[PDB]
Amino acid sequence: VSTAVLSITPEPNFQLLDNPARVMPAQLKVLTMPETCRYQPFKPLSIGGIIILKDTSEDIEELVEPVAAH
Amino acid sequence: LNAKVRLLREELQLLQEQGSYVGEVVRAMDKKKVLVKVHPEGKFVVDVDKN
Amino acid sequence: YEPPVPTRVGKKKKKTKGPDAASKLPLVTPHTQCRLKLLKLERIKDYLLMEEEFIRNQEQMKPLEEKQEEERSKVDDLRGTPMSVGTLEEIIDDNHAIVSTSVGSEHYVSILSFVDKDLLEPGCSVLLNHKVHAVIGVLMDDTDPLVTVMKVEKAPQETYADIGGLDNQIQEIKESVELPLTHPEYYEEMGIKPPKGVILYGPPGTGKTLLAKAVANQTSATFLRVVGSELIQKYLGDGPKLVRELFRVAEEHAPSIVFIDEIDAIGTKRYDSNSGGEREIQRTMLELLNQLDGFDSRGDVKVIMATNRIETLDPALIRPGRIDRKIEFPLPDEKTKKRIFQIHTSRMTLADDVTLDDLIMAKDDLSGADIKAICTEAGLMALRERRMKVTNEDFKKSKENVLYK
Amino acid sequence: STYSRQIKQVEDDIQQLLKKINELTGIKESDTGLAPPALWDLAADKQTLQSEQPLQVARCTKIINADSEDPKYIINVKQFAKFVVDLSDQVAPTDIEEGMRVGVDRNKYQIHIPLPPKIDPTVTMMQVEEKPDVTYSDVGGCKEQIEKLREVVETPLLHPERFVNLGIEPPKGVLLFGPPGTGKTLCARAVANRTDACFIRVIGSELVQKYVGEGARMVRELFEMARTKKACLIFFDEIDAIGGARFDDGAGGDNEVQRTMLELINQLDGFDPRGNIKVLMATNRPDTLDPALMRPGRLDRKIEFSLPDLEGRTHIFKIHARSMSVERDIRFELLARLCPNSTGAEIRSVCTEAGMFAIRARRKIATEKDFLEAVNKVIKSYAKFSATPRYMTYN
Amino acid sequence: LACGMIAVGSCNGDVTSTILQTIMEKSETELKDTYARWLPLGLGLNHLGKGEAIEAILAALEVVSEPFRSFANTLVDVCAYAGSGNVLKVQQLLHICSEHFDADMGAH
Ligand SMILES: Nc1ncnc2c1ncn2[C@@H]1O[C@H](COP(=O)(O)OP(=O)(O)OP(=O)(O)O)[C@@H](O)[C@H]1O
Ligand SMILES: Nc1ncnc2c1ncn2[C@@H]1O[C@H](COP(=O)(O)OP(=O)(O)OP(=O)(O)O)[C@@H](O)[C@H]1O
Ligand SMILES: [Mg+2]
Ligand SMILES: [Mg+2]
């Protein structure tokens, strides 16, 4: 304070998870990939773990780049 | 029965806790201070427990 | 080694007691609501704004350890708990003193800075740390049971209007115990200190204690009442000690009025409980001589003494300088007797056949106590007969009870 | 009244400011004897609480093998115990003597600091610390008396060089005696105001105590504390309380009080030298004093405060009527002639009552008639209670 | 000190001129000496109690180096309002008293 004056003076309902996806056992029953995606899983996505995805189209495969260990 | 046993074992430790003095209040003071007289040990100015 | 030299002059505490402390604001004059009082008050306000801004700035950049709540919180840590109550025996130095615990053991301890050094006198109750016994405070001594007994807490309901016939007697007592306090300017412009002491003497029941009751009713000073027979003690020296302590309490509660009622009873009555005989009473008398007018400077302490036997008092006790005024209380005359009867029957419900003129000559040596006793007993006769109206027969039977038998 | 509204606004702001100032400044409370926070050296106190250890007061009793290099000291720790200890390394061996109080630690009880001798707090308070407001100019009619009193109790301390050169031993005691109101304590109060040495006021009734041997003990500590000073004055007001003559009435009549007088007599002139103490005794009953106390070497000078003469009474009238708003032509010589044998206290009352007759009459100036009425009221009307007639026989 | 005492409260420009003239001629190091503190006092005494007659003088004091300039202007400004009671003037002095330096910088 200055001197005294003297007398004079909107959380989203969803989230996209990349691959790999850190997914809870509880997220399993609520996680499902978008319908329009080119890939479709073999077993239901609520099972979890490693799932192999079927390929509807035959375009260029946009894979993920492996990360070197620390 | 479990509470009776549990209280019995804890009593042995409790009974080893030092006893409390017996004093007489002369007057109350500010900041929860009380002037007391311990029976053989004269006067003291003591705190007051929060309870 | 060399003895420590104190920097404080003397070994006694500061005489001033119970001041405004840091709130001793100046007496701005005049009290009238005008410009310069506003101007004077503004200057007081201005410096406070300066004071407020300066203090805030220092504490703002003061270390977290050094804060007003932190230092006070620290002070408890240095004091610790419990705080042992001791007795100050001697002040060796400014920060050093000898104190004695309740067990009778003395310790040479250090007086901490936060203790009020001006309150320290030998014999005072001090607060000591439980572990290191260092002086960490001074316990304000509670009011002694002896202090409470002398002090008249509630002013008596008897006023000057309830006194009849003692016009001159009332007037003389006012100039020595009432006028100096209410109107001190009259004395100052005249260049005289007020009459020092006063004694009220006369036959029993003449109104000596009543005038003191009227004095205590309309006084702004502390009133201490002591009967002369209370100064006769069971042990040697306690008689002089009680007189010394009685006038010490008067000095603390200045201004004060000390009423030594029935002063002659100290000598006219001999009790076996008083170990020393007439010799111990004489020592008590000599102590009272010192208090009334002695070496010690006396504050605003006014002394009133009452006695029905003034011939038995030591003349040195009532000498001028000690007791300046000797007000005589004569037996009431016809005019006063009628006034006393009207005073004590004002709240009564008298009958049409009761005349006060006949009751005036109930006895030749009639006093105010006899008149009040006649009325009080007369009402008691009506209370026995379940009546609110006091008849002449009730008063007639009253005289034969109090005055006779 | 146009500023009544503005007064209270700045008064309330001021009162809020002191309450606000006291919040940060502190100093609230004092019942535990707390000094204002401006005097709190908490940094030093924490060091003091650690560096300076507490010391128990003990009295040395006997020094064992003082000649050798291992001197053992026997100490009496009040009510605690008795210990055979050695001196600390920070205190000289010659600084502790037998029978003196010492400070000892709580671990090995080694003597750490010599201490002053124990003195009763009541005796300590008996010394005067505020000098009275009475000077020798306030005493009238006592010219010759005052010079005799000063030349024994004031001159030797002020100018000691004029006595040692001629080999003069000045008297060390003065007895002031006279009827009440003659000015015995007034002159003593003048002595204390002017004196620069220590002045101790003792009242004879203060030496009367409940237990046996106290009055003698208090006298012993009184002179013991007086001897700890280069020059001292002890005033014994109303010495006749304890100074009465010894007698044997079969029973133990005044035996304890006589011992108090005997101890006082021993200190004044006994085997040991008294010191540089000059005692001053005042009494209105000198006929009752013990012959040994009324003897030179204990009471060398006997200054009599007799009733003032006409010149003296006129002087006292001027002293007390100095600040009065008296008339121009007040005949004070006449007033002194109207009270032949009257004490100075009566003259003061005459002056006070003279202004009382004028204050009663709502007059700001006291006429000569008021003094005439004052003499009648004081000297004549109050002559029944006068202490002069009985006390001139005693003096 | 002397010429300030002879011409105290007179605002004599002749004594004023030299007191400035000696002050800024002196080197920064010798201004550390405490006998140089008497030069502003002589200037202050020469304007003792005048009040609003120092701004021209205070203008000349800005040229003088620090911390003596802090010392110099404070001394003359105080002497200008001596015996005036101006609460506004004592407002700035405590503002100097508010900022505490961890001696050489706090000489003023
Ligand atoms: N002059 C009087 N006017 C009115 N009431 C009086 C008067 N004198 C005495 N009394 C009454 O008498 C009562 C008792 O008398 P009081 O206690 O005053 O006696 P005293 O004169 O002090 O005598 P003592 O103490 O010697 O007996 C008082 O309470 C009062 O009501
Ligand atoms: N010589 C005097 N000159 C001026 N005033 C005097 C003189 N003598 C006495 N007085 C006044 O009379 C008062 C009487 O008190 P003082 O102490 O002098 O009495 P005292 O002689 O000690 O009496 P007591 O024998 O009763 O103790 C003094 O306070 C003082 O005001
Ligand atoms: Mg009574
Ligand atoms: Mg006396």
Cα–Cα dist E24/C115, whole Å? 52
Q: Which residue from D79, D287, D123 is spatially nearest to D216, judged by alpha carbons?
A: D123
Ligand 2 atom at minimum distance from D283 CA? 25
Q: Which residues of C touch B35 (CB under 8 A)?
A: 85, 139
Give the distance from CA C109 to its chain's centroid: 37
Cβ–ligand 2 distance for D348 under 6 Å, the answer yes
Cα–Cα dist D320/C190, whole Å? 12
Provide the shortest C-alpha distance from residue B33 to chain C (in Å): 10
The answer to whether the CB of D59 falls within 8 A of the CB of D99 is yes
Cα–Cα dist D385/D343, whole Å? 13
Cβ–ligand 1 distance for C204 under 6 Å, the answer yes
Using CA atoms of D218, D219, D220, D221 in order, give the dihedral in degrees to the nearest 10: 50
Q: Cβ of A10: how many Cβ atoms within 10 Å?
A: 2
Which residue is listed with tokens 């007191």?
Answer: E19
Which ligand ends up closest to the CA of C322? Answer: 2
Cβ–ligand 2 distance for D344 under 6 Å, the answer yes
Longest Cα separation, chain E: 39
Q: Say whether residue D66 is in contact with chain C using an 8 A CB cutoff.
A: no
Annotated binding site of C for ATP: 202-209
Cβ–ligand 1 distance for C374 under 6 Å, the answer no
Q: How many residues in chain C?
A: 405
The answer to whether the CB of D350 falls within 8 A of the CB of D339 is yes
Q: Say whether residue B27 is in contact with chain C using an 8 A CB cutoff.
A: yes
Which residue is listed with tokens 């007037």?
Answer: C171
C-alpha C330 – ligand 3 centre gap (Å): 14
> Taking the CA atoms of chain D, what radius of gyration do you get in angstroms?
29
Cβ–ligand 2 distance for D281 under 6 Å, the answer no
Q: Cβ of C76: how many Cβ atoms within 10 Å?
A: 13
Q: List own/partner pairs for C47-50 with CB under 8 A and 24 or more apart.
A: C47/E87, C48/D14, C48/D17, C48/D18, C48/D21, C49/A4, C49/A5, C49/A6, C49/D17, C50/A4, C50/A6, C50/E87, C50/E90, C50/E91, C50/E94
Chains that touch A (3 or more CB pairs under 8 A): C, E
Cα–Cα dist D54/D46, whole Å? 14
The answer to whether the CB of C303 falls within 8 A of the CB of C197 is yes
| Residue of the CA atom closest to atom 4 of ligand 2 | D139
The answer to whether the CB of D151 falls within 8 A of the CB of D194 is no
Give residue ranges of E with CB < 8 Å to any A CB: 87-88, 91, 95
Q: Which residues of B touch D32 (CB under 8 A)?
A: 29, 33, 45
The answer to whether the CB of C86 falls within 8 A of the CB of C109 is no
Cα–Cα dist D48/D69, whole Å? 33
The reply to whether residue D353 touches residue C318, judged by beta carbons under 8 angstroms, is no
Cβ–ligand 1 distance for C343 under 6 Å, the answer yes
Q: Which residues of C touch D187 (CB under 8 A)?
A: none
Q: Which residues of D touch C71 (CB under 8 A)?
A: 26, 37, 40, 42
The reply to whether residue C57 touches residue E87, judged by beta carbons under 8 angstroms, is no
Our CA angle for E44, E50, E51, nearest 5°, is 90
Going across the sheet that includes D277-283, the strands are D198-203, D232-237, D277-283, D173-177, D301-304
| Residue of the CA atom closest to atom 4 of ligand 1 | C163
Cα–Cα dist C241/D235, whole Å? 19
Alpha carbon distance, N-terminus to C-terminus of chain C: 83
From C52, which residue of chain A is nearest by alpha-carbon distance? A4
Q: Which residue from D117, D40, D108 is spatially nearest to D72, judged by alpha carbons?
A: D108
Which ligand ends up closest to the CA of C366? Answer: 1
Instruction: Cite the beta strand spans of chain D per DSSP E.
Output: 55-64, 72-77, 81-86, 101-104, 111-114, 173-177, 198-203, 232-237, 277-283, 301-304
Q: Which residues of D touch C114 (CB under 8 A)?
A: 34-35, 37, 39-40, 42, 45
Cβ–ligand 2 distance for D312 under 6 Å, the answer no
Q: Which residue from C321, C176, C198, C289 is spatially nearest to D347, judged by alpha carbons?
A: C321
Cα–Cα dist A8/C49, whole Å? 12
Using CA atoms of C29, C33, C35, C39 in order, give the dihedral in degrees to the nearest 10: 50
Q: Which residue from D5, D246, D361 is spatially nearest to C38, judged by alpha carbons?
A: D5
The reply to whether residue C50 touches residue E85, judged by beta carbons under 8 angstroms, is no
CA torsion through residues C36, C38, C44, C49, sign: negative
Q: Cβ of C369: how many Cβ atoms within 10 Å?
A: 17
Cα–Cα dist C343/C348, whole Å? 10
Cβ–ligand 2 distance for D239 under 6 Å, the answer no
Burial class (CB in 10 A: 0-12, 13-18, 19+), E77: buried
Q: Pairing between strand C222-227 and C125-129?
A: unpaired
The reply to whether residue D31 touches residue B45, judged by beta carbons under 8 angstroms, is no
Cα–Cα dist D194/D128, whole Å? 12
Q: Which residues of C touch A6 (CB under 8 A)?
A: 46, 49-50
Instruction: Cite the beta strand spans of D109-172 per DSSP E.
Output: 111-114
Q: Cβ of D158: how many Cβ atoms within 10 Å?
A: 14
Chains that touch B (3 or more CB pairs under 8 A): C, D
| Tokens found for residue E50 | 């005048």
> Taking the CA atoms of chain C, what radius of gyration do you get in angstroms?
29
The answer to whether the CB of C367 falls within 8 A of the CB of C204 is yes
Surface of A (26-45) touching C: CB under 8 A: none
Cα–Cα dist D123/C237, whole Å? 15
Chains that touch D (3 or more CB pairs under 8 A): B, C
Give residue ranges of A with CB < 8 Å to any E CB: 3, 6-9
Q: Which residues of D touch C182 (CB under 8 A)?
A: none
- Residue from B26, B27, B43 whose CB has the most chain C CBs within 10 Å, to mutate: B43
Residues with Cβ within 8 Å of A46's Cβ and at least 6 positions away in sequence, in order, are: A28, A29, A31, A32
- Residues near ion ligand 3 (CB < 5 Å) are C 209
Resolution in Å equals 2.9
C-alpha C192 – ligand 3 centre gap (Å): 31
Nearest to C85 among B27, B44, B47 (CB): B44
Q: Rounded to 5 degrees, what are φ and ψ at C348? A: -70, 165
